[PDB]
Amino acid sequence: STTTNSNSIGRPNLVALTRATTKLIYSDIVATQRTNQPVAAFYG
Amino acid sequence: STTTNSNSIGRPNLVALTRATTKLIYSDIVATQRTNQPVAAFYG
């Protein structure tokens, strides 16, 4: 009458891992260009 | 301790230039046909 009571479990199966991260949306919000100087200046 | 307080900028990066202008929609509003005389006279 051996049951699972006699079966020690060394390690669990992780199965899955998840990171709690924000969906980042700014690419669709801000006009984008790169700056190549410490100061930028736009023309109106 | 050289920091941004010692450095200077010759000219800024323009990055972008704009012009706010009216979207001109008349082409889709008025039937258009060129005249080759100082006076036009349409037929009803």
Curated annotation (Swiss-Prot), chains A, B:
Proteolytic cleavage at the N-terminus by the prohead core protein protease gives rise to the mature capsid vertex protein. Homopentamer. Interacts with the portal protein. Interacts with the major capsid protein that forms 160 hexamers. Capsid protein that self-associates to form pentons, building the capsid in association with hexamers of the major capsid protein and one dodecamer of the portal protein. The capsid vertex protein self-associates to form 11 pentons, building the T=13 laevo capsid in association with 160 hexamers of the major capsid protein. Belongs to the Tevenvirinae capsid vertex family. This is Capsid vertex protein. It comes from Enterobacteria phage T4 (Bacteriophage T4). The gene is 24. The chain holds residues 11 to 54 of 427 of the full protein.
